[PDB]
Subunit: 263 residues, 4 copies
């Protein structure tokens, strides 16, 4: 199941900077993961991803391949930048610009990971379904039922870990973390309003998704996703995320804005 | 100084989606502010900027103008999206993708503005600077002054009140262009605060990689706004900052995120 | 009136590969000449134009400028290639790809200039009309009536020369020859059907225009434009042209297909 | 041989406007025929190609696929225009703009086919090439019968005109578009070497560098390539280390079906 997700994030090469991906409406995290893979193939091997910004323009159709075209923007003394277009039926469904940097020691500092319960104690989402294994095991701190909200603070904490063995290749961990970053995210914005994201009449859609990979990490041990929604207004919802490993290291940050509209 | 900037953010048009901008090495906020104008021209009148992401690829040259090419990406039922290339000397120096939406009523919540002293007690940057040195288009009153030449191990937070140094039209578009400009002040340098180095100290290579912004709510820049910045991380010869901009009455008007090179050599 | 073309082809630079040119529908030759200037600005000094191919997508608007955006396609050991996009009202009206080569010594041969009366005995188009000044003086072997017309062979011969003394810069002669190359051309295809090119309800417009500059030349001495229409079929007419100088040297060849339609 | 080429010119679809073609350096005719196929897939079914212009920028490699990217430039009331990029190793080897139009009735005239001996009395290139093959030996996709033979390894000073009859080697489908792709392919044979005739150098002699720069074509009238067509070629000029050739293609009954123009590099080292 992980095996199958990883196989799917490993794209078929059509030509330099033209890739073709299969699908698991497509999960945004699939398009993100796949686009990272596509961009990374066009960069020097040593320069790993440190940031990306993306916009989702159209929904992706899960029954059809997605073509990833990669435009080489710049290769400098430190940075390589690439723009990925995800294409289906001759139309872009998503664009990402990503940047890549050689690892190098420099100034170090970070904030503090929130105080939360460890994972061992907590029930998985698959287990809370008991009242097929998922590629990524999620263990929430607090369960937020998608079919009935309740007015809650705009904060959500979730431990997550790859459901299986991961290879010793940090690039693969980065693609999967890109995938993983689009779970348990945007719905956090509905929490003060008491509506679950899958309730009748709720229109919820990602507009943009951006991520910064600060430090190395592995997804075969537990990471914590700390999400806050600092704002909602104008039928949009805004969420900021930070991903910590179990020892407290700040590994990645994320930002996302989406449509949140009750009909 | 403000009328000059405001004229300078008012772009010379060449065609539908091509614009030329005069410069004031170029200040990142200028490029950001110019690029926003460029995109907003190509969008339908009811739709205002709600977000942008940009990357800086090459330093701009202050002695020459900048061409802004604007690609139309999509015109949806509510959202329009534009990509702006900033071109100098045959080469792109900057790329922004921005999104615009019609003002609409929906779910409202926000976090809480940090408690800080009001602007009235506080000295402006120009005045502080004068001790260890003219009119500036935007006035800045820091809560705590972080000296660009000196500096000590401080918490990676910063708080700065700002306001336009002059008179502003009643066109919200121009405020937004100006807020894009102002968001690139007092920002990335916060990432040096834990390391006891000021950003103008010799050997300090500091440079913006990317700048992104989300305009949550309407505002005016002819009254005082607060910029609350934190550097949540630095590693790998990068520094990372997040910002939030609040009006006096506490309304969260915009958020920003930027990563840059920080290297002492 | 020639001084005002040579200035009108000396394009205003915006940035490297971006060009503004005043208009005088725009002619076509105007667009070709400006396009050729735009491209030559982007190429190494030693390399002069040897060929272009162009398509016409939309009618120009004489009231407004045209931007000419130039993509660099290749810079080889001998040849450089450029694609010029002529933009007005945020739409492309015309595209040209042009190739440039430095003058070099090689194999020489050519065909023979048609047998026609010399220009010295011939009336100019300004004299037959007498029966404002023109930038290029034209003396036709046979004047055709653009609002009348009768059936003749699909061949046309006209001598031409710039109405004025031109600079010693070969580039400007080439821009001007490109301009001149769209005069007395496409109408030739009507000659066999008895219809003038200003007759009412006759739809006529250049689809494509291509040229090869075989040899150096001056447009401040007589050149002969020798034009045949070898075909017309499906609302298109096809012409081929060859341009010889006074002494019989073949300097350029042309080819054009155009819409020719009876409403 | 014909079957194999027709299967090569029928490209694999990767997405809207993105196709990949296998190779028989790459013969220009293959690139041309494949590019017309690519462009035609993106245009309405009734609008057939009437013209194209192309530049060759780098040699193609036969051992690897070619990706054809098709850009939509305009779909107007009558005309659809498309620009095809042939890509290999992330670089363009060739660009083509092609225009397509609705088959209809309008003014009809043409020049006259040159009077040449018919193909029945003429030997084929493959039969003639026996005796020097030790330009080509076994079955070819298109049978060529030249009016005069031009030995690629030994020139003789001759006028800059060439006339050759040609035809597909086998039954072709009843689809015109295939005939057009295959005619695009055929149009690059017996063409640029015509420019060497006055200079008495065979196009395959040691030191002769000959390379297509551009290739353009106009499809005037419908035709079939499973009956004899005449390629009438002339070289009107050479200079500057370039050679210039114009072609006109006639069917046996005298109809002018297509015209062609190419310039190439012709340099003796």
């Amino acid at each position: 199941a992980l095996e199958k997700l990883l196989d799917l994030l490993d794209l078929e090469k059509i030509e330099e900077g033209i890739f073709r991906g299969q699908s698991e409406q497509v999960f945004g995290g699939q398009v993100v993961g796949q686009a990272i893979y596509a961009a990374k193939q066009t960069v020097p091997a040593e320069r790993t991803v440190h940031s990306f910004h993306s916009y989702f323009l159209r929904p992706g159709d899960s029954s059809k391949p997605i073509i990833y075209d990669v435009e080489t923007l710049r290769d400098g003394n430190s940075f390589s930048a690439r723009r990925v277009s995800a294409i289906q039926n001759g139309k872009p469904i998503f664009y990402m610009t990503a940047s890549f940097q050689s690892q190098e020691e420099g100034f170090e500092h970070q904030n503090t990971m929130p105080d939360v319960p460890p994972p061992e104690g907590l029930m998985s989402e698959t287990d809370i379904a008991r009242q097929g294994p998922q590629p990524i095991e999620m263990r929430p701190v607090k369960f937020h039922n998608p079919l009935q909200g309740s007015v809650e603070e705009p904060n959500r904490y979730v431990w997550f870990r790859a459901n299986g063995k991961m290879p010793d290749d940090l690039r693969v961990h980065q693609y999967l973390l890109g995938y993983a970053s689009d779970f348990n995210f945007l719905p956090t914005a509905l929490q003060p309003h008491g509506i679950g994201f899958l309730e009748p009449g709720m229109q919820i859609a990602t507009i943009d998704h951006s991520m910064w990979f600060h430090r190395p990490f592995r997804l075969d041990d537990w990471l914590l996703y700390a999400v806050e929604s600092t704002s909602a207004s104008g039928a949009r919802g805004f969420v900021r995320g930070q991903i910590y490993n179990r020892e407290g290291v700040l590994v990645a940050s994320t930002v996302q804005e989406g449509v949140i509209r009750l009909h």
